[PDB]
Amino acid sequence: SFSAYLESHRASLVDSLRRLFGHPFGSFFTCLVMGITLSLPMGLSLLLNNVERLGGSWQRAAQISLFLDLKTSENQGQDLREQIERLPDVIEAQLISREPVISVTPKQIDRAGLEALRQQLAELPHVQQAQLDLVWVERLSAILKLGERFVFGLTILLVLTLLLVVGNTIRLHIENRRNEIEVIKLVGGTDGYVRRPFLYMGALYGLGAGILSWALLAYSLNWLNGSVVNLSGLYGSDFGLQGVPLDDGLSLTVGAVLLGWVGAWLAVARHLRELAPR
């Protein structure tokens, strides 16, 4: 009955819309909750991604201050400039004049012990004094991976709270209006037949929530742009937090839809197993 297979989906959807359009205040009140819940995790992903764009402040400092010989020689420093480019754990040793020294920023942070590379660097044409402070490396390495534990914890906690709220709400909603699940079953019908409409309105709730979060997050970031552009121009730069990419937003919404769908399976399964003839 493939033709009827198509008809089941068609009638199921239009009925849900009438059910959804009916009782609008309650449906909106529900949809808003998991929309705003869904906003938080992906919003934090966007925030961390945006700060990843400004990925030069991590290294920033901690340049090996290899003092060039007190006697002025720009040519010798320019000659040794390119060798540092070859080696890893560095970027480029830019030659500086007396008004001499040459410096290079690292890529990672490492820790105490990687200054053996600095002592090895203090064997070059221009070596007056190798200068690479340690304690800064210590403090920076303490700050990082501490940030990593911190972000790890926030991420996992927030993912769990989102999953719990969406699952519980879908479960309770399915528990209400129970009479259908049996009144259709005893007279006949299959598992998929009774299951379909419940999949449908859950999918609609997920879609609506996914849409609402988009607008909320975009408005919030636009609100916060005021200070970020100020400080960006203020520091002598141009880095303002940007808007929502559509490619990411569609992935945001589809996740909500599939989440509602799987929640529909989970909620319906309990009742279906409960009302077994046993």
Partner: peptide, 16 residues
């Protein structure tokens, strides 16, 4: 179960 419950019509004291 459906393949047998869909062949018989019924009615109940507490109609559903």
């Amino acid at each position: 179960i459906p393949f047998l419950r869909r062949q018989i019509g019924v009615v109940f004291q507490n109609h559903q």
